[PDB]
Amino acid sequence: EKTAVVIDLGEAFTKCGFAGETGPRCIIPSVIKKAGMPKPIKVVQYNINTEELYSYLKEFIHILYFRHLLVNPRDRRVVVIESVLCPSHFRETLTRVLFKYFEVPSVLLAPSHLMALLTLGINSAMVLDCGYRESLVLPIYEGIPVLNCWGALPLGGKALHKELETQLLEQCTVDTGQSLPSVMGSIPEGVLEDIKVRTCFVSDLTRGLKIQAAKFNRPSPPPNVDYPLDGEKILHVLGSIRDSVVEILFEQDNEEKSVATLILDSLMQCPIDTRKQLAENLVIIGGTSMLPGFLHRLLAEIRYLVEKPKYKKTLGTKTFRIHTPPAKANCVAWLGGAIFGALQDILGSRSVSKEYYNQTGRIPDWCSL
Amino acid sequence: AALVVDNGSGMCKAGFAGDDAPRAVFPSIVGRPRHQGVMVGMGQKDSYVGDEAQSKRGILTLKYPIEHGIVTNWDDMEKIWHHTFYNELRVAPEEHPVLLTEAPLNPKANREKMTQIMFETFNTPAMYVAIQAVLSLYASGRTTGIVMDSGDGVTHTVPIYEGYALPHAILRLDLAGRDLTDYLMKILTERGYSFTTTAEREIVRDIKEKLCYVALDFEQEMATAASSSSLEKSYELPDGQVITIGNERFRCPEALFQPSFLGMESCGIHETTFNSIMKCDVDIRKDLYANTVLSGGTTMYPGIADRMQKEITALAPSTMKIKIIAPPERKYSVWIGGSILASLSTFQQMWISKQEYDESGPSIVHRKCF
Amino acid sequence: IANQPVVIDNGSGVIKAGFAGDQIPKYCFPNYVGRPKHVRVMAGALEGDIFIGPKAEEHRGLLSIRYPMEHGIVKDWNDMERIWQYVYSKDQLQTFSEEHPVLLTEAPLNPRKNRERAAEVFFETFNVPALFISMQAVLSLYATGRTTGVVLDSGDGVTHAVPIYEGFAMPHSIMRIDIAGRDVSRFLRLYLRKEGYDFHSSSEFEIVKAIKERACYLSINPQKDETLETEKAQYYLPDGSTIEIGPSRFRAPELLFRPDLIGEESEGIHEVLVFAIQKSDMDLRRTLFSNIVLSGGSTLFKGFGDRLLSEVKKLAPKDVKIRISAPQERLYSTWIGGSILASLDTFKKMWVSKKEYEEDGARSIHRKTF
């Protein structure tokens, strides 16, 4: 036979992979930066035209597998991986590129959550999905996704950068190159994100309480962890601002919004034949949330919100576990789909062909078949 | 030599002749899971059944395949059958004659269809189907006795005399604990508890059997309960919820004595049984007081024997000495009686072979099954 | 005192009130919870943001709205305290609890604790001299003038069918499933979730409600209409969000008649409906099939009555035609029935005197609850 394609829907990254590939292959930022491009073109560009994006997709895929491995994908199948909430018109436009332009043998939609389950291959599990812009707790009991148990916090990595630029735009505690306090307006997002991503260690809960105390009417924020700068302007200021981001990450201040909040929501839709199972199933996943030392703040907030009076009746006294990931950073769904597409020659029949797409041109989601 | 298979809309059992414990014991309910529209991988069985469905009860919805004898689908019933055979014994049906049961009020076309498919699908050498009550008194040790069946969805009073009996004398009301499960679930819903799926039914039937004791007069019991709420016992479910009920417990089986709880335009179990006794001989009725035999799986509740005793005690004269036969194993006793029935060679000379339907058709079902 | 008594009405989505003689409830106040979105940085503000009508239309910054009675299932009461308190405040009717007797209704299938808490408020905190609690469909019947008829209606989050002849109804024959418009709003936003739009809080929920009751209809052939093609008209928000919808603009019967296709466990209005009708007297059932009181404050879409007719045709004993009843607006009929109710001799034999409440309370509440 041959290998296959393994690509997921990532606002920041859409890696490619083969069938049963053991080990990562190549990660590239989802935006498309071309010749004479002042600012690269993203992927999450909805209610935008289809021909320009169509073209971008064509040449980007073109050079993508070129500089990946220069393979001829008109020979092997594709494993499409989803990320819900995206308009199907967009997804089908991708399909339009694939089949009506490149004519690959067959393609096949798939859920990222499935591959995450495939990392352990068990039947029932919680979903600790933490994507790039939103999160999702849509458990997979018996290897089956739990429909109404959904929710998403539009405050992911991109919004985290927005928070960073907000905080640092408020105070330029760096020097000239004498301090240049908010002199210019544009920011080096790559540098900002380098500082951010290269310094993401989560702090203690007590430290977050100190931040809360600093909100209204402070105990030693340094030794502060934040990564060097450039542009002849480097500094050593409070890196505790990232912990402030961790605090605003979970807001109960007349908002009551957190990850545990969605777990509670799931619990509300959960029936008794799901509760203890999920208490066992303390699935530990999440894409952009690669947060170092987040177990502390995380677990503490979990076992901090268990004590909520309106939720002890719902919870009782439920203990949890740590369903450790054998995979890596975000390779979870990537390699999950890789090995998942390995011997799925059987499911190659389930992989939508261009043949049927000629006379069809449509793939149905929850619609009238 | 044989193939003993006790049946039931819930409890379906199996084994062979001479065996004392039923090899097959499982809920004969059909589980149908939440087949949704989005994609999924690695699959599952189309519809798990009973224990198979109970294993994954969170999606599987064990709806009833039978309804007081009204089998919904024969196909699903056969799926239950086939898998149960190739689940418990894994033996082919051509080995020995089968043994199954049924009860009256059933249109003859059902038992005909039943046996018809039993020869179709299975091609057994011979076969046989009977009445549970026969095995009940048969395992009891009498040829003269009145019993009553209280299964999951059945109720029937059978008076026997030296083996002889009368269909006019044998009365029947196919109503049982399932109705009580509905009543109990809705009243606990009134108490403030959510109940939507079939798992709700399972948990409530569970605790239902765990708490349906039998007191005497709900007026004074209710007065004591409202007085002292100590009887209102607590119980914590698999989920953190812990309910407290005291009346509910024993007052749920009071509907058996009173259709008023459901408004059924019917009579109490005691007076119904009394009328069954009334359709007899003045001498043999006395023997019914002597042969006060009790059966039914939904009669595993303590206190009702004394209740029913007191009922008829108020009904019948003092000279009518009550002698209640109360076996606490009546549930499995039918299967056991089937094994004992499968042990008497003469009965095993009497059969329902292939050629009978092949030539005779299904009329021999009417004159041979019983 | 012989003043005009206060007639408070209810509602999971739209709650009303009035007096015995009002022909119009002066306020079409919805059932919700005004709150802050964030911790107000400065103390001494609009405490809890208890906003009503224009006060709710005043600002939107720290303003998170909720429901204090989810789908009829009320959980907390502090919101209710402030809501009722606002009504008691001299901006609604400018009267007192003591100045006028109070009439009120209650939704069925509820624990007694709700009644307990409410009466505790009305007599402890506020002081009603004579109160009452009734149903809703009865009042709608009085508004329609019928005293018989298969009553049917559906609120904002509660649906219920009650078979009635001269007011008589069997509790067994009475059916009710509490799921309506609120979840339809939840699914409208879920449709747009698939379409990728703004999803952060209750503001969008309000928007979607305006869509649901404004930029939404119901078709008749979802398979055909799904396979058809439109250009999907848009709307303009305060931002002017020109957003297209399509099938999702009318994908509601897959929640009304087919909610199970959302991997859910339900039946369908018509099913439960017909079942409840089937619980009655077959011939009286047939007669009442010609007079089926149809209502519903959320069932405000064209063509859906035809879809119901299709369900009827699939379920009625064919050639016994039952055409479409198309009552467009269904809200104040209950309020009207309550006004007519308290306006008659009714409340004189049907009040709840504060004195009797002081003597017994829940005892009196339930001894006079029927």
Ligand SMILES: Nc1ncnc2c1ncn2[C@@H]1O[C@H](COP(=O)(O)OP(=O)(O)OP(=O)(O)O)[C@@H](O)[C@H]1O
């Ligand atoms: N151990 C028990 N204690 C109390 N009640 C029981 C027990 N076992 C069964 N029951 C009652 O019996 C019913 C379950 O069905 P049962 O055990 O009578 O077999 P069955 O399937 O009814 O047999 P058939 O259908 O042929 O009568 C339920 O209504 C349940 O309340």
Ligand SMILES: Nc1ncnc2c1ncn2[C@@H]1O[C@H](COP(=O)(O)OP(=O)(O)O)[C@@H](O)[C@H]1O
């Ligand atoms: N130690 C870390 N802590 C938190 N986040 C990290 C860490 N290391 C990398 N990341 C972030 O995880 C992100 C993965 O994003 P991803 O979920 O792949 O976005 P998308 O799904 O849109 O492709 C990377 O953008 C990276 O910035």
Ligand SMILES: Nc1ncnc2c1ncn2[C@@H]1O[C@H](COP(=O)(O)OP(=O)(O)O)[C@@H](O)[C@H]1O
């Ligand atoms: N045009 C419409 N389409 C769908 N639903 C509507 C429409 N108009 C009102 N509704 C919903 O129906 C409800 C009215 O039903 P009603 O019987 O008044 O219940 P409630 O008293 O709980 O509001 C309103 O609360 C509203 O949310």
